[PDB]
Amino acid sequence: VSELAGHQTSAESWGTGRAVARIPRVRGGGTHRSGQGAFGNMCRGGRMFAPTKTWRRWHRRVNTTQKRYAICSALAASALPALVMSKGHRIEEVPELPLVVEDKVEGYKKTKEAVLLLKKLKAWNDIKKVYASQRMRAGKGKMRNRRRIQRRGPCVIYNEDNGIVKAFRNIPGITLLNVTKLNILKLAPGGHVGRFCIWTESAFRKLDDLYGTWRKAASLKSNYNLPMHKMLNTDLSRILKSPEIQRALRAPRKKIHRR
Amino acid sequence: MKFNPFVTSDRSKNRKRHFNAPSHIRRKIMSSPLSKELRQKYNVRSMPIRKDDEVQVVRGHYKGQQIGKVVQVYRKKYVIYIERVQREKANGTTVHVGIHPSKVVITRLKLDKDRKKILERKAKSRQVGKEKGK
Amino acid sequence: APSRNGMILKPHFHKDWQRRVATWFNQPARKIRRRKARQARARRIAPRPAAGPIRPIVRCPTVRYHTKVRAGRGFSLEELRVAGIHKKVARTIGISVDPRRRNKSTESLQANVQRLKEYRSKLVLFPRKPSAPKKGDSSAEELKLATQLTGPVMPIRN
RNA sequence: CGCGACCUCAGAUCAGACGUGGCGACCCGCUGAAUUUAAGCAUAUUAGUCAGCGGAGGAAAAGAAACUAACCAGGAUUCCCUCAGUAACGGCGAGUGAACAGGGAAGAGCCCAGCGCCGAAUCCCCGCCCCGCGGCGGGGCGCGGGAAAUGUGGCGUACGGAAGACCCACUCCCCGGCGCGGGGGCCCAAGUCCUUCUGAUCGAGGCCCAGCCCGUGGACGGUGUGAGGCCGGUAGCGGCCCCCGGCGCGCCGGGCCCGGGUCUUCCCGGAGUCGGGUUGCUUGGGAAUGCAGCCCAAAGCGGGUGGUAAACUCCAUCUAAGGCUAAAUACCGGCACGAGACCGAUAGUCAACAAGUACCGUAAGGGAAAGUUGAAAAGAACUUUGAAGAGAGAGUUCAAGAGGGCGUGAAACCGUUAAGAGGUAAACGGGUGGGGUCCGCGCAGUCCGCCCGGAGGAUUCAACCCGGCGGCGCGGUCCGGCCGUGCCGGCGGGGCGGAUCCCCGCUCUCGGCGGGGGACCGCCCCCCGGCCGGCGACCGGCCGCCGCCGGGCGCAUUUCCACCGC
RNA sequence: ACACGUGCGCGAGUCGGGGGCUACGAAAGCCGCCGUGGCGCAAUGAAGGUGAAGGCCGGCCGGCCGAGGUGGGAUCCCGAGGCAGUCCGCCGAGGGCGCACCACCGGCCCGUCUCGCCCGCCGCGCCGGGGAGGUGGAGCACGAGCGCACGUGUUAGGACCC
RNA sequence: CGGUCGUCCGACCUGGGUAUAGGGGCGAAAGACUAAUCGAACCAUCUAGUAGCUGGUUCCCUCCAAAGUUUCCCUCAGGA
RNA sequence: GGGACGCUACGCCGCGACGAGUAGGAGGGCCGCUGCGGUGAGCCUUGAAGCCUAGGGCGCGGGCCCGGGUGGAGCCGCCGCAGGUGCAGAUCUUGGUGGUAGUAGCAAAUAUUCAAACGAGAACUUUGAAGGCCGAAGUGGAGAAGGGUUCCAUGUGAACA
RNA sequence: ACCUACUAUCCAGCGAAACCACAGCCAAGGGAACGGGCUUGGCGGAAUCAGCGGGGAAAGAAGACCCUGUUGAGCUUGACU
RNA sequence: CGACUCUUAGCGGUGGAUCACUCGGCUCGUGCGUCGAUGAAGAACGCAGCUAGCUGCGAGAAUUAAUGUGAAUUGCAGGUUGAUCAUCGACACUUCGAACGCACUUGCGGCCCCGGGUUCCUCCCGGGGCUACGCCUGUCUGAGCGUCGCU
């Protein structure tokens, strides 16, 4: 809010007496706005309480290791079939969820080739779901250049740009991403993880050089390796009925003894 | 997406240009597609309308296959007036009903020295997309 | 009114500081403006290096930093006199010259002369006119291999 | 005195030009408080702050050390990080509060006076010629006038410079002319295709084998609700047409004979200025950091600085009292833009509208309220009462229950209809009862499984054969792949790294130095080979078993459907 | 701005926040030979400065053991026993290594006070230092911080509003 | 506003022009007048001046639950 | 040597004990508002938001879902994010409306009456007559300051008198 | 005590304002120490008109009389600077 | 059942609350960054067929010319060799205002040059160009018992 809002008026309180409420009031005049109350947040017009300033802390900084940690978590959750289903992606007809495509699609220069590729990969159903999700927004966003909203589509990751960006940008939901320059805002939309990702062959092979394995550090980061696991066998159902624990257990008590 | 940084995408600004456009810009907004028989012959998609053009009404309450000519072009209302597109007043007089040029197809044009000049020029660059694009 | 346990603080906010508040929203736009002017300058001096003239090898004062070596303002006149380069001609071939610098040591004087010797060997000099190549210019084949040098020319590594 | 120079000082509606004032967001030079804090208050703090004055510019200012430092030293100014809430100042209280160095953005240096050399070698105006002439520009001619010896121009500025002798070296730089991408304007893809709703579709379904068509164009806006294909537009290193100087070539009018190294001889610096005393203001600057008034008032191996006043002695570092200079930097004014996790007519600028308007005060000044018919006025023709305002019919519209301050029309309040009630003001909590209101769509009150009966109707069961699929396997260990967040081996190879140990070049053939080997060690990858594990974060084939599905039979005491007993 | 608590990543390290390189995107990613610099890793004294275990053996030197102890200490280890006769596991009187943490006694670093014996060099003293016993320190004694976010509380700011 | 009153040839009344402007003017003197404002006029700004002093401080449920007492403060309506 | 349910493990189940509350503190909200990133092949002119409601209900409660009417164009559920996020008061601000109340009141300066004209409408308009007042320091006739079309003719009884 | 004029009264027309927690019958008791509301009693009947000043601790203005504030102003001086 | 008064509901009055809309604000960022004596900013007064305000303009007065564009403007009448819009480089721009002949009454001038008026003869009238301050170079006319020089 402007710092001159509610402060351009010249006002003075009438003091005690005169059966008024001691608020600063407009100094005279043969008009409606004369002794009507200028300052204070309770009055019509005037300044509002705690005027918002430009120097509010809008931006936030995150540690570089933490920024790289979420990207690794975002990429790893994009290969599990159950997590991507929970993102609403209609890709049950996809042959393999780690979708690796040949490097010929970088040479695409028409959107008809990109549409046909999605039909052949059976990922078109998610783009078809985008059409059903196109509706004008609820609330005041329609008059603030946010008239139309739609669902996220699949994400296409390319090692190099040779026309693939041009041929894919006209399909709604399709978001293009470079391999060396990833983004957590486009890999995990809304904070939830498990967006459908489509990789090219050179894109899929460069992941071993940007983050490395656990026995070999990344060749393009200065000093970065994959984070260690807090626990290894995450399926505790297999652990709990494994024989080694099952010897050193007492007898289960499951007879209900009510009052 | 639009990629020109100097092209406005604001809703309030775009409506300001439309409702406060000058008269020479008002004509350009009032363009209507030609009839299908004209379209292979002239190779022109749409064209601004003039005072004497044959009009079929496509949408609205007065749509049909009737052939009527324009009476006048009212650039201040975004309204054109067609010959037999009119409704009955109370007192017995007849009033022309306003039809927006968007719901208008032109079946016959008004040929002129300046009218004909646009036809090859619009058909020139229409072809250019088929040599450069091919 | 202080609490039970805490610090004694002196907030320097007793002036009218709210009027003189410098926001930094120009910073992302400033970086583009710095880059565009830098790229436009490089195309103006397209054969010359983007960093500019070379900088001498400089020891630091203030004994805290006395074991470090930086890049300096310009080569001293004693360093140019030993290298056999006139002080008014070195500035046209990309050598930083300043008359303020001294030469108390011999190692640093000899290091900059040795630095100047390898710069003269690496310098490809174009003729004044292409029709008449003069004596002190580079060979004709070196004209076709003249390229811009990115970053600081001959970086000073400690 | 006449006559004639020169110095001072006047007059011009003299010839030719210049300044005034406005804006003032950012900048520079002055002047400059009190609210407030210190729980009072007087020094302090607010604060070099508000207000007042003057002056510019597109940036201003500053700026190339009379600098910082005491290190092995850096090296113009400006801005960011850090120094640092530190040194330091402070009724040492509240509080105030820098600078060096380092890393970055940017980076460009220079010109006078004086010292001297050149015959004033210099400059302005007026007239003429030639050529461009909206910046009168250049060159040539002036026994044309004037300025200038009370000092113009060239060389020349502390980094040294000037003159002479000896070597080396190219002689070609620059003004006024001409001809050989930015801004603006006009255009460029694809459905109004079939059915169905609506007052209107931009709503719903479809357009198979091109699941309509275009898409480098599915941003936005308008069009009678929701549109990529109706239109303007958008994308495109797309097309076409003009203006601008440019970059380089060529011709001529042109100035243009230039410097560097060695030796010798010379020369060279800014005065009521520095500095000191005192006073006042200021600063973190504390026995004055800085600025200013008065007084004293300099020197040349000199002067200034070296954060405690002074004396002596070594050093360290610059050359003040003259000047110019872009970039990084700031920008609540102006021009033109783009955008928003912002606000939505008591919000957001005071002002979304004939807003600094109506209005008020003599004046300085104060300063509002106020958006929405309908898609389209299609704005109610005509009849009738009344003088008319106002009605009653009729008509438009999808809707007048949208009828001119007209979208939606809440509450306070009022009018009217229906019901109930009414001498302890009204109203309320708990418990009932009565009356209304609509609802249960209740008005003959549950079905679901298992078994029996008999009536029926099937293409029908179990068991076999064939094909496909799936699961499991301890197949006690079948065979083969793949991996290791496993290990070992290497007449192994690579790529690296290492603070493990011959060659190329340079400042004094051997001693010193930087760089490149090679070897060694360590890591990773690959060729493998030998174990271990796995394929349940990750596997295939054969074999066995099981299950399911599909097709043949099997054909009715099997199996499956339909009906009732109360 | 600070204090505490909690969550996350790294860890004796941690961090670009300032600067460079690659519609949304003014985003995001990259650069540590861009970690300069901030905090921590060492404190103490006004300052000059100084600056963090010892014991044994043999003759001030040469070898060895080499990071304090006591009590309480969650947890872990052994098995007298007991669930004709072995293995698994159970529990078990009693006996130990003892995590963190608490109390105490010691040890080491800096300043101060007192008392001595001495040695020694590049310039033999008004020199340089060691030792013993008290005392003061926001110290050491096998690390714990850094960066971001959240909440509370105290402040300077107009500071919950008039 | 009414009745009743003082003066009404001189220190009389009055129009217009003009001069004195705020810690100032002016005052046959009442702290009177200075544009209905005077023991310091009006407008704008500092300023959203400060207040240990009044008033107010916006949804539900669950759990726990007070003190007006020590010492110090130019401390007694307040703080530590 | 061929077989019921279960287990959103932040879930489910069983035992006992207890339940006050000002200032104040903490926790849980599938309580409520606004906008943003995701998500519901979400709702919607065969009717969105908003508003009214003698209906059916749910939750202790903040509140919420259906039924009916009006309305005509947007809106909501869940996971996170963010705030200018909840009113009964502040002699609160703006705006609107009540009782008082058809009440106080339309009482300073002697006074109006008759007839005619006009008009739909006459106590107030016009004309005639009568009775009065201002009584030349006027309720008369003209100026200055000030006002600025108020001056004159015609017409109107929309707003004011 | 009587008379006159204009009101006040009623009617034709036009028509506000102050004030308003809810509103208004009392005796005694208690209470925050003088109640319209609470307790015990006395009791209580629509809608109103003209007066009337006992009550509503009536309306007018965050008491100016008194005190506090580490709040001020006009003035004085042998207060401090 | 009455009149009056209380509660609830329907409908109708007052009122514009809520919602949905927005050619408007607010904030941030980018490019440029330009006033005037050749008369700035500002102010006054006039200009349309019917125009009160707003907007535009200046006696050429809701605009002249030129270019681009291409069949209108419109509330009502009127009239392609270029209507209307935009661009704007030519032309023009009443009176105050740094405001400029003196003053601010809009009153008084002075100099020069033209046309009626003369037949330059003084007038009168109308029109055109000048007449503010300070200051720079240069020119002209000057002043001085200031310093001199020649008769």
Numbering used by the authors:
A (entry chain AL04): 54 to 312
B (entry chain AL26): 1 to 134
C (entry chain AL13): 2 to 159
Give the original sentences from the paper that presented this experimental model.
Toxic dipeptide-repeat (DPR) proteins are produced from expanded G4C2 repeats in the C9ORF72 gene, the most common genetic cause of amyotrophic lateral sclerosis (ALS) and frontotemporal dementia (FTD). Two DPR proteins, poly-PR and poly-GR, repress cellular translation but the molecular mechanism remains unknown. High-resolution cryogenic electron microscopy (cryo-EM) reveals that poly-PR and poly-GR block the polypeptide tunnel of the ribosome, extending into the peptidyl-transferase center (PTC). Our results demonstrate that strong and specific binding of poly-PR and poly-GR in the ribosomal tunnel blocks translation, revealing the structural basis of their toxicity in C9ORF72-ALS/FTD.
In the 2.9-Å resolution cryo-EM structure of the rabbit 80S•tRNA•GR20 complex, poly-GR density is most continuous between the PTC and the first tunnel constriction. In keeping with high flexibility of glycine residues, however, poly-GR density is less well defined than that of the rigid poly-PR and prevents unambiguous modeling of GR20. The GR20 density in the PTC is incompatible with the methionyl moiety of the initiating tRNA and with longer peptidyl-tRNA. Furthermore, poly-GR destabilizes the CCA end of deacyl-tRNA in the P-site, in comparison to the well-resolved CCA end in the cryo-EM data without the DPR proteins (negative control). An additional density is present in the rabbit 80S•tRNA•GR20 map, which is not present in the control 80S•tRNA and other complexes analyzed in this work. The density at the intersubunit bridge B658 near protein eL24 might account for four GR repeats in a subset of 80S particles. Alternatively, this density may be part of the eL24 C-terminal domain (residues 64 onward), for which no unambiguous density could be found in our maps. Either direct binding of GR20 at this location or GR20-mediated eL24 conformational change could interfere with intersubunit rotation required during all three translation steps (initiation, elongation, and termination) and may account for an additional mode of translation inhibition by poly-GR. Here, poly-GR may interfere with intersubunit dynamics critical for the elongation step, consistent with poly-GR being predominantly an elongation inhibitor and at least partially accounting for differences with poly-PR, which appears to also inhibit initiating ribosomes.
